[PDB]
Amino acid sequence: FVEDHRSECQIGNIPSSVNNAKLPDPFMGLDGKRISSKADWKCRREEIGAMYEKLMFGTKPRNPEKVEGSYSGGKLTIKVTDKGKSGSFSVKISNAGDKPKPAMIGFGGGCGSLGNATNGLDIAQITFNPDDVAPESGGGMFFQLYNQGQGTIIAWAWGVSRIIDALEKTPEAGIDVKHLAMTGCSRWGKGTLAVGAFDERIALTIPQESGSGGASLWRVGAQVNKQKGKQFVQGLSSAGTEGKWMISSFKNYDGKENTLPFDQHMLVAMVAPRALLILDNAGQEWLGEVPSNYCGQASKEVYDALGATENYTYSQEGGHGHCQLPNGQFDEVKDFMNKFLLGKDAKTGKIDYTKNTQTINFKKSEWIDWETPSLKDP
Ligand SMILES: [Zn+2]
Ligand SMILES: [Zn+2]
């Protein structure tokens, strides 16, 4: 039970430019060799994260000197010691536990945007206000401790990682750290994806309407915008500027998405093989209906290769308001939370899109020219 295995893996050269109008291969090691075993994924996963930290998010500070947790009055207060100073933040908690309880962590300050989809599930709720660590205006407690030009998203992933640190040594909070989910919508759907991708202790990642910078293909977004003759979908530059989410260099890819050494199917692949339920909308122009769908479809290759097809679902339902989840997706939320948080079996693993407003025609031959290997068991 571990945040990541980065220190167990040798990270080689990270190029910042390629020439590839197709999706980059996620099974291609930095050492130039394709992986063949499921055991090779431990380190291949770290190599992808290191690429995102170098190229898009910024470096995730690791191994903090000390994390202290205290639980009082339904609020968990986390004090982090690092780099000569201290930084503190607190999260609200609902439900409790001698008898620890599985928990959903949600951006807020509401706790995420799943609404009544969780009603009837005896799980705890932890609200994380990302402004406590890194407001989109800049500044924040994170940047009191650190100063390597990171963006705000990786500061939120750091934040949630420190919540889990404090939880592991605060049993009076009454939370089962072995059964934790993460969720959030829109800007906090981009935040949720990165959170679950960069902390392996998140057992269920539920990014909602995460859009550009989230689970949406940079190359497909740029294609759609060329087909429309205008910025129909939120483009790379805009996602690389808004909210200080990304490092300042990332927006320089904007006219040249084919030079990206990655695409967002590889961020999704950082969550594998842990459970991942992507809740998407449709008919939202800026959100990117087609590039999000195509990211959803393309990302299945890594989960299939690891033999974890049952742990990944992309669910797109349009025809409803932004971040207001329709009842047609309540069954998804309940099935995954029962399965991966509460130990109750359910049929999971699906690629489903309905109530679209654009033509959905994902042809693997256009976007994927690498074979999906058969990763062997050791
Ligand atoms: Zn690992
Ligand atoms: Zn459903």
Numbering used by the authors: 155 to 251, 254 to 265, 270 to 538
Copy text from the publication.
Glucuronoyl esterases (GEs) within the carbohydrate esterase family 15 (CE15) esterase family, in a range of aerobic and anaerobic fungi and bacteria, have been identified as playing an important role in breaking down LCCs by cleaving the ester bond between 4-O-methyl-d-glucuronyl in xylan and alcohol groups in lignin. GEs share an invariant Ser-His-Glu/Asp catalytic triad and employ a conserved catalytic mechanism that involves the formation of an acyl-enzyme covalent intermediate, which is subsequently cleaved through acid-base hydrolysis. Rumen GEs adopt a canonical α/β hydrolase fold: FsCE15, PrCE15, and RfCE15 adopted the canonical α/β-hydrolase fold that is seen in all of the GE structures solved to date. The fold of all three enzymes consists of a central twisted 10 stranded mixed β-sheet flanked by α-helices on either side.
Crystals of FsCE15 belonged to space group P41212 with a single protein molecule in the asymmetric unit. The structure of FsCE15 was refined to Rwork/Rfree of 22.8%/28.5% (respectively) using data to a maximum resolution of 1.93 Å. The putative catalytic nucleophile, general base, and general acid of FsCE15 are Ser346, His482, and Glu369, respectively. The catalytic residues of FsCE15 and PrCE15 are positioned in the canonical conformation characteristic of CE15-B subfamily with the general acid located on a loop at the end of β7. FsCE15 and PrCE15 have a conserved disulfide bond between residues Cys345 - Cys483 and Cys225 - Cys356, respectively, which anchors the general base within optimal hydrogen bonding distance (2.7 Å) to the catalytic serine. Similarly, the addition of a reducing agent lowered the Tm of FsCE15 by 11.5 °C. These results demonstrates the important role that the disulfide bond in the active site of CE15-B GEs plays in stabilizing tertiary structure. FsCE15 has a broad pH profile with maximal activity at pH 8.0. Interestingly, HGT events between Fibrobacterota and AGF were one of the most commonly observed events by Murphey at al.. This observation is supported by our phylogenetic analysis showing that FsCE15 clustered closely with Neocallimastigomycota carbohydrate esterase family 15 esterases. FsCE15 also possesses structural features that are typically observed in fungal GEs including: a shallow active site lacking any of the insertions in the Reg1-Reg3 regions, catalytic residues that adopt a canonical CE15-A active site conformation, and a conserved disulfide bond in the active site. FsCE15 is therefore unique amongst bacterial GEs characterized to date and may represent an intermediate between fungal and bacterial GEs.
